[PDB]
Design a binder for this molecule. Structure first.
Ligand code: IPE
Ligand code: IPE
Ligand code: IPE
Ligand code: IPE
Ligand code: MG
Ligand code: MG
Ligand code: MG
Ligand code: MG
Ligand code: MG
Ligand code: MG
Lengths: 328, 334
């Protein structure tokens, strides 16, 4: 693992990487401290996912966004990182209940080990914790995080009420773009970046988050649990039709009637899920989804290009390549 | 059928006072209605489902009555506080109905019966964002109070579902749980009502203490209502605690009795009960148990404590209405 690599992204320079690595570690320490302040009745459920792993993509994105401003190591950037990751963690607790996930980060899901009730409450406690933490940053950050969480939940809700491509693109911008947008906005604000750099990092975050979710939906089909830390074909199993599945479902082919039959609702038979994965992996619809993913990567590169010629810009460019190429 | 608003079920005192209080609670309602209707269309059905079905609006009334202690009871900030408290309450009902597998709330299908657990989970999560954005209007002190209050409420819910291996008396553990899951939020209603009405530091602390005691009484009443009320009285199905395996105060005292009726109840309550005839039998035994009398004695002790708490407030109409609200807390049948 190269010394220039932090949370899977080659940042290109070992001293810059060490600084970003330290920034991501400070976020981890503030979260670890806040989770361990909880009542003993909360502690085990709260540590369950936190200690299992996770890429810390959102702390990395926050810290890289803060590298654009003149105070990237500001205490307030660490608080912003911790707020974003706390919200992210809260959403995994609820999302794994909603998707009936048995595995998360290569271990039993919070709901598999503790049950849905403990998982729902662990997620609610993390949202209270995020709320107390963001209060430290002032009223503008409080409003950004409340609005951000409203958007994220709107996306989750839009997905559940939900085969439309435009609806899917609104879902992923809401449920995944909004929070990475907020990470960029807050990393910019609390590093002392300019108003213009703050808006550019927010737009970048939103596009990166959209790309991130499309890659997640591809990972659902193309990755094995060894790389993803979760069960492939969860979207097939739950009847969530993501972009590769929507494009596969618009194909004509000797197996397309069979795939239409398999994906016509939730799939509770694991062998049928595996059969649907075989058909999806071979579908030209997968290449169509990957081409859309590349279009979002191109939009993100268009956004970040007008940041300054500073290590943070190169590091964001490498993060965009990681967002779309990662296997987990 | 579902219980009426608390403001319709108490003697508020003189007409000029009843006027002022009814209007205060209506302003809370009007602000919540507006805030719920600003959500994206995709949220709208689920966010309005429980709010429109009914609910007693106990917590708006508690906030408004707490504000009558202060010299600015009708301040816009009091209305905001009342809406924030009820928005948090509403969020907890969406999650609690999922966790308790409740099919009925406020005389309607629960949000989870209507749309499934996922819609209810997300409607609850959204309401937290709404409450958060509203309380931001009141400043950082209020933001912190609501964060800590929600954290405590959630801790109480977790403590109920997890149980404990600590050396605690079951009644002692029960009282700690209900103080967290129900007391914290009514205490916060007293605190914010006192704060934003300009009440003294001592009055603010007293109202917070009063709300905590009233919330204990409120939850003991809720646990009795689960056994003793029919669905037309409570707006929900009796015997949910028996079905889910939650041992409430009447159940804890019922199981300390000796004899065959206790043996029969002990067998029925050994875990969750899914058979409707067994749930009815347990309810019959619980209604008849001296354990129910013991639970009502504790309810009466908390009513007396609440009367003692509110006696430290000034001799003003708000105080007399808070006394009527204590009486309602323990006398209601939904
Ligand atoms: C929004 C999505 C796709 C949930 C998973 O997020 P990550 O893939 O960032 O999960 P962890 O690395 O935190 O485990
Ligand atoms: C936590 C969020 C916002 C949900 C992301 O969508 P997914 O449901 O596809 O995420 P994974 O469970 O696949 O990580
Ligand atoms: C804390 C508890 C017992 C949940 C129900 O509260 P209420 O009995 O006040 O419910 P609504 O009137 O708002 O429906
Ligand atoms: C919403 C909260 C804090 C739960 C109160 O306990 P219950 O689970 O007994 O409340 P009901 O469902 O009976 O209203
Ligand atoms: Mg999921
Ligand atoms: Mg999901
Ligand atoms: Mg996924
Ligand atoms: Mg319940
Ligand atoms: Mg409950
Ligand atoms: Mg109850």
């Amino acid at each position: 693992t190269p010394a220039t690599v932090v949370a899977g992204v080659d940042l290109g320079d070992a001293v810059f990487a060490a600084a970003v690595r330290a920034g991501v570690a400070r976020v981890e320490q503030l979260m670890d401290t806040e989770l361990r302040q909880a009542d003993e009745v909360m502690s085990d459920s709260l540590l369950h996912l936190f200690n299992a792993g996770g890429k810390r993509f959102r702390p990395l994105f926050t810290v890289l966004s803060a590298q654009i401003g003149p105070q990237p190591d500001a205490a307030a950037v660490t608080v912003a990182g911790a707020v974003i990751e706390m919200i992210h963690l809260a959403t995994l607790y609820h999302d794994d209940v909603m998707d009936e996930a048995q595995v998360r980060r290569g271990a039993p899901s919070a709901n598999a080990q503790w049950g849905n009730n403990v998982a729902i409450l662990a997620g609610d406690y993390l949202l209270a914790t995020a709320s107390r933490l963001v209060a430290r940053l002032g009223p503008e950050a409080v409003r950004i995080i409340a609005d951000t969480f409203a958007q994220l939940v709107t996306g989750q809700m839009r997905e559940t009420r939900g085969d439309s491509i435009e609806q899917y693109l609104k879902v992923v911008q809401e449920k995944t773009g909004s929070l990475i947008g907020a990470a960029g906005r807050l990393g910019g604000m609390f590093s002392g970046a300019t108003d213009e750099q703050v808006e550019r990092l927010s737009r970048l975050g939103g596009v990166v988050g959209t790309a991130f979710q499309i890659a997640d939906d591809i990972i659902d089909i193309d990755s094995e649990s060894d790389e993803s830390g979760k069960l492939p074909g969860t979207d097939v199993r739950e009847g969530v039709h993501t972009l590769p599945m929507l494009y596969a479902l618009r194909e004509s082919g000797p197996d397309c009637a069979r795939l239409r039959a398999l994906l016509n609702g939730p799939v509770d038979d694991d062998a049928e899920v595996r059969e649907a994965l075989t058909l999806l992996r071979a579908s030209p619809g997968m290449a169509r989804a990957k081409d859309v993913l590349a279009q979002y990567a191109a939009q993100a590169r268009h956004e970040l290009a007008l940041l300054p010629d500073v290590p943070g810009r190169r590091a964001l460019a490498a993060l965009v390549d990681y967002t779309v190429s990662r296997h987990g």
